[PDB]
Design a protein around this nucleic acid. Structure first.
Length: 92
RNA sequence: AGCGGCGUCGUCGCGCCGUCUAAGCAGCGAACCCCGUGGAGAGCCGUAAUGGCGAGAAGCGGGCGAAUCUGUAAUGGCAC
């Protein structure tokens, strides 16, 4: 769940941000969508409406950010293609 | 700067006054704010200053939106 994200950011297709994740989920190219625990409830409506598997993240977005490689905060992130990673195995 | 008066004038050519125009009506809209795109971090964008940013910056479009300004009212008043 944690080390897989390192390879998901190293290799494969990923997009950071709520809106681009919405677009990827509606398009369906995003195989899985990863969300932080304390995200606003306004985002969960799409993540349930979208058929994409909903991988929870136990932490908050504040520490989700730095582990993903970005100093800022990450609310909802999608990985379009895993490539050299197995975070999808964590999700499905 | 030009035009019309008044003053001074031992010498010079300066000094002062005037050269106006209401509400109403019609048009335009600076900031803030709202929306559609946009995809920015070993960092970028700004302010007199505080600052803003994947919970979406810069940039690009659209919308709501001031005083005041432009025309008319424009023929009234002036040593017409």
């Amino acid at each position: 769940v944690d080390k897989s994200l390192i390879k998901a950011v190293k290799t494969g297709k990923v997009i950071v941000g709520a809106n681009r994740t919405i677009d990827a989920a509606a398009n369906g190219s995003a195989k899985m969508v990863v969300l932080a625990s304390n995200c606003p409830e306004d985002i969960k409506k799409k993540i349930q409406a979208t058929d994409i598997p909903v991988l929870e993240y136990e932490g908050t977005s504040v520490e989700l950010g730095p582990v993903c490689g970005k100093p800022f905060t990450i609310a909802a992130m999608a990985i379009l293609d895993v490539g050299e990673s197995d975070i999808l195995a964590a999700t499905a």
